[PDB]
Amino acid sequence: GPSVFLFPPKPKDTLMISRTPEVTCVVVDVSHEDPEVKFNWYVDGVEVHNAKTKPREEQYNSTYRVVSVLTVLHQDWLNGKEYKCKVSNKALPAPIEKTISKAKGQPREPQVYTLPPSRDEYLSDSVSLTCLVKGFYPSDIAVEWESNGQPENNYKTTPPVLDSDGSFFLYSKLTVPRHSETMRRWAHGNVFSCSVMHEALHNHYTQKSLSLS
Amino acid sequence: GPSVFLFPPKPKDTLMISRTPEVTCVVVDVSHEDPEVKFNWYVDGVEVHNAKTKPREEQYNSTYRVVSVLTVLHQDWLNGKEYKCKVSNKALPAPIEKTISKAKGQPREPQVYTLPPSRDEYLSDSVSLTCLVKGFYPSDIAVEWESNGQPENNYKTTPPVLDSDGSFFLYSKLTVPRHSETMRRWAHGNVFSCSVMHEALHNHYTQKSLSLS
Amino acid sequence: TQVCTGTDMKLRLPASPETHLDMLRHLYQGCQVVQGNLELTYLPTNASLSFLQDIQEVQGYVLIAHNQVRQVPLQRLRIVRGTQLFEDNYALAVLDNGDPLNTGASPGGLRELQLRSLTEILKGGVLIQRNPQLCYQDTILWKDIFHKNNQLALTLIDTNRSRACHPCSPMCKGSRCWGESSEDCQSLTRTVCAGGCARCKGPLPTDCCHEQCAAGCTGPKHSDCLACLHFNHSGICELHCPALVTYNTDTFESMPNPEGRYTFGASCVTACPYNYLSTDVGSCTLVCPLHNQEVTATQRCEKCSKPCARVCYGLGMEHLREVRAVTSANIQEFAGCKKIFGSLAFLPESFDGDPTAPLQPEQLQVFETLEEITGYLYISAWPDSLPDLSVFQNLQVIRGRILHNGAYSLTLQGLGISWLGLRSLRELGSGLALIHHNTHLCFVHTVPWDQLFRNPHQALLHTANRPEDECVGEGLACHQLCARGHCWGPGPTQCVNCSQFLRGQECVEECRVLQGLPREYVNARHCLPCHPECQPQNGSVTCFGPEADQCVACAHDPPFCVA
Amino acid sequence: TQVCTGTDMKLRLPASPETHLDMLRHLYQGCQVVQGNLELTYLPTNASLSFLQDIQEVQGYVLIAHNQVRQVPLQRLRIVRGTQLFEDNYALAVLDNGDPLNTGASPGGLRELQLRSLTEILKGGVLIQRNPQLCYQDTILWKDIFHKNNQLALTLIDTNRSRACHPCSPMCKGSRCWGESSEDCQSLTRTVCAGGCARCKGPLPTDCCHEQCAAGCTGPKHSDCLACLHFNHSGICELHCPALVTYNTDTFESMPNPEGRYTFGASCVTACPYNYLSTDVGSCTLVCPLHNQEVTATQRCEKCSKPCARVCYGLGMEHLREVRAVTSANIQEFAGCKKIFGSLAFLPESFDGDPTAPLQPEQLQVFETLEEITGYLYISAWPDSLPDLSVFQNLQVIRGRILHNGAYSLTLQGLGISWLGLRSLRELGSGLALIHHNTHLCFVHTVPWDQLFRNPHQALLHTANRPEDECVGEGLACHQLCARGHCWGPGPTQCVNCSQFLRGQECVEECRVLQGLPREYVNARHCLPCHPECQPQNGSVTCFGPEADQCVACAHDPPFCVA
Numbered sequence A, B: 001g002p003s004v005f006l007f008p009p010k011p012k013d014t015l016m017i018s019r020t021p022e023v024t025c026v027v028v029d030v031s032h033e034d035p036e037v038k039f040n041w042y043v044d045g046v047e048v049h050n051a052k053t054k055p056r057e058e059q060y061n062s063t064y065r066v067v068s069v070l071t072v073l074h075q076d077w078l079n080g081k082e083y084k085c086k087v088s089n090k091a092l093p094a095p096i097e098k099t100i101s102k103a104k105g106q107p108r109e110p111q112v113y114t115l116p117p118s119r120d121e122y123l124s125d126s127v128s129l130t131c132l133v134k135g136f137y138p139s140d141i142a143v144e145w146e147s148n149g150q151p152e153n154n155y156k157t158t159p160p161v162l163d164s165d166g167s168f169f170l171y172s173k174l175t176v177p178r179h180s181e182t183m184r185r186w187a188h189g190n191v192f193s194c195s196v197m198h199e200a201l202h203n204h205y206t207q208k209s210l211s212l213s
Numbered sequence C, D: 001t002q003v004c005t006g007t008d009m010k011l012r013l014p015a016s017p018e019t020h021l022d023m024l025r026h027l028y029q030g031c032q033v034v035q036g037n038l039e040l041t042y043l044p045t046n047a048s049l050s051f052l053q054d055i056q057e058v059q060g061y062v063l064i065a066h067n068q069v070r071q072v073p074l075q076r077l078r079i080v081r082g083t084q085l086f087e088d089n090y091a092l093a094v095l096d097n098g099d100p101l102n103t104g105a106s107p108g109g110l111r112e113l114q115l116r117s118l119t120e121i122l123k124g125g126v127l128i129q130r131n132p133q134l135c136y137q138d139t140i141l142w143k144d145i146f147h148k149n150n151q152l153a154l155t156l157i158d159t160n161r162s163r164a165c166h167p168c169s170p171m172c173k174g175s176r177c178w179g180e181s182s183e184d185c186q187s188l189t190r191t192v193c194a195g196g197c198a199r200c201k202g203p204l205p206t207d208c209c210h211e212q213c214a215a216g217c218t219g220p221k222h223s224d225c226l227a228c229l230h231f232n233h234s235g236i237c238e239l240h241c242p243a244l245v246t247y248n249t250d251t252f253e254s255m256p257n258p259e260g261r262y263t264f265g266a267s268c269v270t271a272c273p274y275n276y277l278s279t280d281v282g283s284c285t286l287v288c289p290l291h292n293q294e295v296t297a298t299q300r301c302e303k304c305s306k307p308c309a310r311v312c313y314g315l316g317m318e319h320l321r322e323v324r325a326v327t328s329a330n331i332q333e334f335a336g337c338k339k340i341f342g343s344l345a346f347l348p349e350s351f352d353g354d355p356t357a358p359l360q361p362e363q364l365q366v367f368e369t370l371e372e373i374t375g376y377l378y379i380s381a382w383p384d385s386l387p388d389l390s391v392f393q394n395l396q397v398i399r400g401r402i403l404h405n406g407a408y409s410l411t412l413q414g415l416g417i418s419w420l421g422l423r424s425l426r427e428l429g430s431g432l433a434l435i436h437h438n439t440h441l442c443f444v445h446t447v448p449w450d451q452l453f454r455n456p457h458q459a460l461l462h463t464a465n466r467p468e469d470e471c472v473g474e475g476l477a478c479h480q481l482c483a484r485g486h487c488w489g490p491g492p493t494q495c496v497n498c499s500q501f502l503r504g505q506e507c508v509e510e511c512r513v514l515q516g517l518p519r520e521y522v523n524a525r526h527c528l529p530c531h532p533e534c535q536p537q538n539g540s541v542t543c544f545g546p547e548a549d550q551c552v553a554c555a556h557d558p559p560f561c562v563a
C-alpha cells in the first residue's frame, strides 16, 4: 500500500513575515490501479478546508505522487499547533494520519562562530569557510552565506546534532573553489557573512562576519 | 510483528588488526507470546554457523531483544563480502533477511584539517576544537581525540554529509569545558591531536595536530 | 569662536581684494578676543564690517590704514594690551584712509573712531596721520586710557582735515567725545579716581576698582572687572594662574596640584586649545621653550633628559628666523626631513639670483620625505617645468602654528600649476587656505577642503584660477576608483580615499592575490608582496603575510622556506 | 684533527699536573699541524707521549723544558716555521730536564732529541741549556736546517752532561746523528745541493727542490715538496693563495674570482674553519683587521662604511692589551656590555690593592648584561661572600678565540664557590675547560659538558673539587623540573632544559593562563603577561598575546581596550 510523509515549513519561511510557510503532505506509492487520494487537514483537531493539492506526479516506478500543501500562519506554527494530515485511499485498509508540529521543549538561543580554513586546506582544489552554530534549541534553523551583501550558494550544512547537554549544534561548509570568483573575494579580504535564522534569536536573526587574516 | 536491524562492524575494528570486528543483527519487538527466534548467517550466499547469540534482553514495552553477533575477518569485510542475517520467528509470516556489506564505489582518501576555536567562543562555558574531515569515501570512518598521547572523550562528531562532488565530509567538535583539565592543557599550548582512521588512508591512519596560537 | 587669531600683514597690499574681505569675515566672525593684531586695511567704501562688532579685547595692536570705508564698528572694544606694537611703538595706528582719485554722491574715508568702550591701553601709544574726514581725534585725553605704566608711550595725532566737524553732544563733558552723538561721550576711568587708583567707576573711594582690574569695573571686587589686567581665572582676575605643582617644604619634591591651570593668552584654562602645546611650566604655546622637545601623549613639550634629538628648522625659526624664502643657499638643509619646525616659502627669488644662485626644479625633490610642516606653506613662484606639487606628495599636516601674514597656512598664487599634487594632506591645523591666480590650475573643487579644517574660522579662499567649467571641458576628472569622487589630481595615484586597493601609491581595483606576476596579499586595503621564497599558487592565495613563515608553499626551515 | 692549536704557557708551572698531562693528550691527539707552539713542560718520568707522534709541522716555536721524561716522540716533525719565538729569539728551546732531588733504578732527564725529520727552521734559532743526559746535540750542523734567510738566527748549545755518549752509528756521516742508532742519521737538505739551491734531495742539479719547497722534496716539482714554504693550495706549494677578486683593467671594478681562496695558517682553503673569521682580503683570522667590524651572514669581518660602532674590549685587546686582570681601575669599563671583544681574568689582585683599590662583590654585578666573551674566562680568585658566578648568569658563548695559556677557554681554580651560576651558557667555541681545587664547588657532573664543546680536542679537566659523593650526601640535586636532569645549580632557575614552562628565569610547571593573579599566556614554553587592560577570565584563557588587541575581554577601542 501507499506510504505518507509529512514535512514541516522551511524555518526561513516561519520567521520571515513576507514568506509564506506551508506544511507539505506527500503521498508516494499511489497505485496505478487506485489513484484517487483524498486529504483532510486538521489544526489542533479542527479541519481547515484551506489547503490545496498538486496534481498527480508520476514517478519512475510507475506510481503517482500526490502532494497536498497547507499554507500556515506564523503565529500558529510558532505557538506549537499540531498540523495533521489524513490521507485516504482504496489501497489503504485504513486511512493514514500523520501529525507534525513545533518541537516541544525549552527554547535556547544559538551562538554563531565563524572559523577560517586551515593553512593546509589551501593546497587542495577548494577551501572551506566554516560557520559553527552551537547550543540552540529546537533544531529548526536556517543558515545562509553572503559576501558583500550577495548570497553565496556553494555551502553544505550538516544535520543538527545532540550535544552532551541537550542543546543542538551543527557546522556549515561554504566551499570556495580554486579559481573561483568567491575565492578572489576571499583572498582580497572581502567580507564573508554567515547568516543564521532561529526562533530564540532576538529578531529571529543573527549573522557573523568572516574575512582573511 | 517483530522488526530486524543489521549493523556493520565499527570502522576502527575493521582497520586495526588486534581488534575483532563483528556484524551485529538486532531483533526488536519479539513478542512475549513467541520468543523463539532463530538466526542463519550467510557470507556471499554461504552459511557460516560461527556466530553466537546473546540472551533475551527484555525491554520497557514488554518485548524481548535478541542480538546475534557474527565476528568477521578484516579481509572479507574490506573486500566487499555481503553479510546476510536471516531471522525467523512464529509471529513473522515469512522470515526476515537483511544484507549488509561495504559501501560499493570509488574509494577516496580523507583530508584532515584542525581549526581552533573562534575568539568569541571563549566567553562561553566551553570552547570547541574542530577537526574537519573532507573528501573521503566511503562513509565508514573513525575519529578520535587525544592530548599528550592520552585519549580525550568530550567530542561529538556529525554524520558524514554528501558533498557537491560525491565525496563525504564531516566535522568533529571536542568540547573543552571551562575550568576543565583539558582546558588547562589547551591554554598551556599542549598538543591536541585529532586521530582519523579510514580505508583509503595509507596505513589506514592519519592524525592532525592542533595547539593554541 | 570667543577667541580668534589676529593677523600680521601690517600695511602690505593684500593679494586679492575679494579674499581679503572674506578672510576678515571668516576670521573675526563672532570673535570677542583677538589673540594677535586687529588689522583692517585696504577696505573699500561699499564694504560691510559687521563681524567686528563683538570684539572686546585685542592682545596685540590695532591698525586701521588705507581704507575707503567710513566707519569701523568697534564700540565694544574695551582694552588693547599691545604685546606687539606697530613700528615697535604704537598700540593704535590710524593711517591714510581717504579718496586719492576720481559720480553718485558722498566722499571716501574714515569719519569717527567711535571706540566708546576703549578705556585701557596697557602697553603702547597712539598714531593718527592724515585721515582727512577724521573728526574728534583730538578730544580724547589719551592719558586716561593709557595705563599708569608705560604712560610715556607716545602720542602722535595729525589733525589735517578736508571738512569741519560739529561740536560734541551737549550731554558730554567739554571736549570729551568719540563722535558728534551723545552715545559717543568719552568715558573716563583714570585721573578721576580717589587717591592712587589706576581704574575706577567714579571719583569716590567706593568707586575705585580692584587692583587686578583693567579699563574699568562694575564694583570694588575682582569679579566686577571689565577686563583682567593679567589673567582670567574662572571669572576672577588674578596676577598668575595656579601652578601645576606645589613643592615640598622640607624636601623640594614636586607634588601635582589639582588647582593648577595653564596660561592661554590672558586666561587660565584647564587644558590647552587644539594645535597649541602644553608645557611643564604651565603655559599654552605654539613653540616649545628652549631646551624642550615636542612629543605627544596629546602634543606636549618635555625638557630633554638626554641631548635634544636634532630636528629640522624651517623659515622663521633659529638660523632661518630672518630668512625670506627657500633658496639655493638653504635647500640642502632639508635633506631627508620628515618634520620641519618652521615654515616654507617659495618666492620668485627662490628661482632667481642675488649675487646666491637660482634654484632648479630637481632640487625641490628633497621634500618628498616631508610629512609635517609646523608653520605654513607659501608658494608665489614655482617652475613652469613642474606641473604640480608632488614634491610635497607625502605631506600630511600643515599645522599652521605660524601663518603667512598671520592668516594663511596654505598659499598658492601666480603659478603655472595644472593640479595640486598633495595626495597625503589630511589636516590644515589652523589658518586659511588661499589659492588664486593659477591660470592653469584645475582640481580645486575636487578637494574636500571641509575635511582639512579643524576650527570654524578656517576656510578656503579661491579666485582667478582656471574655471571649473573650462576644466570639465578637456575631460579632466577624478580617476574611476577615487571614492566619493575626491581627488587631488588626474591619475589613480591622486585619489583621496581609495575605493578598492592601494599598490603603494596607485589606487587599483585588483591586488595580485591569486596568480599575480609577483604574488601579493591584502592588508587593510593595501596590496603587499608575498615573500619571494613563497611558491606561486595557481588558483589559491600564495601567503598570509610578508614573511617566509606565512607561505602556502616554499621555493626550497620548519616554518620558513629557503628556489 | 689534522690541525690543532698550540699553547702559550711558556715555562710557567702548570696548575694541576694530572690535567696538564690529559690536556696535552686531548690537544695533540692525532694532531699533524700545530697552529701555535708545541710546549712540553713539567712532564714526569712515568709519562706517555705517544699522541705527539703524528706532529709534522709547528707554526710557532718548540719548547721542551723541565721534563723528567726520557724522550719525546717527534720523529715525523719536519718543519718549524717559528712565527712566534721563545724569548723573542728561538724556534727550538730545550732547557733543564734533569733529576733535582731524591729506589728502583734508572735516572731522570731527556736523552736524545731524535728530530729525524726536522730539516727546516725558517725563522728562529736554537737554545739548549743544561739537560744533563742530553747527547748528540752538538753533532747537528744546524745551518743545514736553518733556511737561507734568517740564517744569522742564534745558536746557543750547552754541552754539560752527567754521562758519556757512544759514537754515532757507523752508517751515518761522521758527527751527523740525532741518536746512537742508525735510524737517527742526520738528513742534510742544504749546503749539499747543486748551485744556489736552498733545499734538495741530493747533490745533483736534478736533485734540487722547487723554489716553493721547504725542508726537502721527493722530486723537482712543486707537488713533490715535503712542506710548503708559504701556502698549500690543493697539493701545490705556492707563494700566495688566489685572491677572492680580480680587478677590471680599464676600470678597476672588482669581480668575484671562483678560484679565490682564504689563507688559513699555511693552507689555502675554500672556507674558514669554525670559530674563525672570514675577511674581504681573503684571510681566516681570530680578530678582524683594524677598521673592520664583526658581523654574521656565518661570522665575517666587514670594513666600516660609517663609524665602526663602539664595542667593548676585554683584556688582551686595545687599551687593555697588557692588563693582567679585572680590577677597580677597569671594572666600570664593562658597564652594560652585551659582548666583550677580549678576555676576562679575575686574579687575587683583583680583590686586593696595588698603590689601585681592591674590588668589591657588588661591583661584579656589571656583567649581568654580558652575553658573549670572544676571548676566555679565567677565575683564580672570587669573593667568599658570593656563592656562585650568577653575575655571569646571562653569558651564552665563550668563543675562545683567545685562550688562557693558549689552552683553557674556561678556568676556575681555588675558589670558595658552591655551584656554577652559568645557566645561559651553551657554547665553549674552543679550548678546554679547567675546573679544579674548588673545595666547596658542587654541580659539576650535573652540567652536560659534552653539549658545550664544538671540536674533538675540547674536554673538561676536573680534579680536587668537592667529591660528587659528598655532594649527594647533604641532599643536593637538580630541581624536579630540570629536563634530563641537567642543571647548573640547585634552584629551579638553574635548569638547563626546562621540563615545563619558564617564568622569566624560574622553570615552573604551571603558567598563569586560567586564573593566575596576573593573567598570562604561553609562547614557546614561556609564561608571559596578558595586557593589564585585558579582563581576568575565570575558567578560560585571558588573552592570545601581549598586546591589548589580543584580550578576551577588556577593562574599559575597536580591537584595543582602555579599568
Ligand SMILES: *[C@@H]1O[C@H](CO)[C@@H](O[C@@H]2O[C@H](CO)[C@@H](O[C@@H]3O[C@H](CO[C@H]4O[C@H](CO)[C@@H](O)[C@H](O)[C@@H]4O)[C@@H](O)[C@H](O[C@H]4O[C@H](CO)[C@@H](O)[C@H](O)[C@@H]4O)[C@@H]3O)[C@H](O)[C@H]2NC(C)=O)[C@H](O)[C@H]1NC(C)=O
Pocket (backbone or CB within 6 Å): A005, A007, A026, A028, A029, A059, A060, A061, A063, A065
Ligand atoms: C517508488 O518511487 C517513489 C518516488 O521516489 C519512492 O518514494 C520514496 O519513498 C521513500 C521511503 O523511504 C521516501 O523516503 C523518505 O524521505 C524523507 C525526506 O526526503 C524527502 O523530503 C525532502 C524535503 O522535501 C526532499 O527534498 C527529498 O527529495 C525527499 O523527497 C525522510 O524524512 C523519510 O524518513 C522518515 O521515515 C523513516 C521510515 O519510517 C523513519 O525511520 C525516519 O525516522 C524518518 O522519520 C524517508 O526516508 C522518499 O521521500 C520517497 N520519494 C519521494 C520523492 O518522496 C518509493 O520508495 C519507490 N519505491 C518503493 C518500493 O518505495
Ligand SMILES: *[C@@H]1O[C@H](CO)[C@@H](O[C@@H]2O[C@H](CO)[C@@H](O[C@@H]3O[C@H](CO[C@H]4O[C@H](CO)[C@@H](O)[C@H](O)[C@@H]4O)[C@@H](O)[C@H](O[C@H]4O[C@H](CO)[C@@H](O)[C@H](O)[C@@H]4O)[C@@H]3O)[C@H](O)[C@H]2NC(C)=O)[C@H](O)[C@H]1NC(C)=O
Pocket (backbone or CB within 6 Å): B005, B007, B026, B028, B029, B059, B060, B061, B063, B065
Ligand atoms: C519497543 O521497544 C524496542 C526496544 O527499544 C523498540 O525498538 C526500537 O525500534 C526502532 C525502530 O525505529 C529502532 O530504530 C532504529 O535505530 C537504528 C540505529 O539505532 C540503534 O543502533 C545503534 C548502534 O548500535 C545503537 O547505539 C542505538 O542505541 C540503537 O540501538 C537506525 O539505524 C534505524 O534506522 C533505519 O531504519 C529506518 C526505518 O526503516 C530507515 O528509514 C532508515 O533509513 C535506517 O535504515 C532505526 O531508526 C531502535 O533501534 C529499536 N531499539 C533498539 C534498542 O534497538 C521499539 O520501537 C519499541 N516499540 C515499538 C512500537 O517499536
Ligand SMILES: *[C@@H]1O[C@H](CO)[C@@H](O[C@@H]2O[C@H](CO)[C@@H](O[C@@H]3O[C@H](CO)[C@@H](O)[C@H](O[C@H]4O[C@H](CO)[C@@H](O)[C@H](O)[C@@H]4O)[C@@H]3O)[C@H](O)[C@H]2NC(C)=O)[C@H](O)[C@H]1NC(C)=O
Pocket (backbone or CB within 6 Å): C225, C226, C227, C228, C232, C234, C235, C236, C237
Ligand atoms: C572671564 O571669564 C568669565 C567666565 O569664565 C566671564 O564671565 C561670564 O562667564 C559666563 C559663563 O562662564 C558667560 O555666560 C555665557 O555667555 C554666553 C554669551 O557669550 C551665553 O551663550 C551663555 O549661555 C546663555 O544662553 C543659554 C541659551 O539661552 C542659556 O541656556 C544659559 O543659561 C545662558 O543664559 C552664558 O550666558 C558670560 O557671558 C561671561 N561674562 C559676563 C560679563 O558675565 C568674564 O566675562 C571673563 N572676562 C573678565 C572677567 O574680564
Ligand SMILES: *[C@@H]1O[C@H](CO)[C@@H](O[C@@H]2O[C@H](CO)[C@@H](O[C@@H]3O[C@H](CO)[C@@H](O)[C@H](O[C@H]4O[C@H](CO)[C@@H](O)[C@H](O)[C@@H]4O)[C@@H]3O)[C@H](O)[C@H]2NC(C)=O)[C@H](O)[C@H]1NC(C)=O
Pocket (backbone or CB within 6 Å): D225, D226, D227, D228, D232, D234, D235, D236, D237
Ligand atoms: C698539502 O695538502 C695536500 C692535500 O690537500 C696533502 O697531500 C695529500 O692529500 C691527500 C688527500 O687530499 C691525503 O690522503 C689522505 O690521507 C689520509 C691520512 O691522513 C687518509 O685517511 C685518506 O683516506 C685514505 O684511506 C681511506 C680509508 O681506507 C681510503 O678509502 C682512501 O682511498 C685513502 O686511501 C687519504 O689517503 C694525503 O695524506 C696527503 N699527503 C700526501 C703525502 O699524500 C699534502 O700532504 C699537504 N702538504 C704538503 C703538500 O706539504
Ligand SMILES: *[C@@H]1O[C@H](CO)[C@@H](O)[C@H](O)[C@H]1NC(C)=O
Pocket (backbone or CB within 6 Å): C158, C159, C160
Ligand atoms: C597739517 O598737516 C601738515 C603735514 O601733514 C602739518 O605740517 C600741519 O602742521 C598740519 N596742520 C595743523 C593745523 O596741525
Ligand SMILES: *[C@@H]1O[C@H](CO)[C@@H](O)[C@H](O)[C@H]1NC(C)=O
Pocket (backbone or CB within 6 Å): C538, C539
Ligand atoms: C592554472 O590553471 C589553469 C586553468 O585553466 C591552467 O591552464 C594552468 O596551466 C595552471 N597553471 C599552473 C602553473 O598550474
Ligand SMILES: *[C@@H]1O[C@H](CO)[C@@H](O)[C@H](O)[C@H]1NC(C)=O
Pocket (backbone or CB within 6 Å): D158, D159, D160
Ligand atoms: C758546562 O757548563 C758551564 C755552565 O753551564 C760552562 O761554564 C762550561 O763551559 C760548560 N762546559 C763545557 C765543556 O762547555
Ligand SMILES: *[C@@H]1O[C@H](CO)[C@@H](O)[C@H](O)[C@H]1NC(C)=O
Pocket (backbone or CB within 6 Å): D538, D539
Ligand atoms: C570562578 O568559578 C568558581 C567555580 O567554583 C566560582 O566559585 C568563582 O566565584 C568564579 N569566580 C569569578 C570571578 O567568576
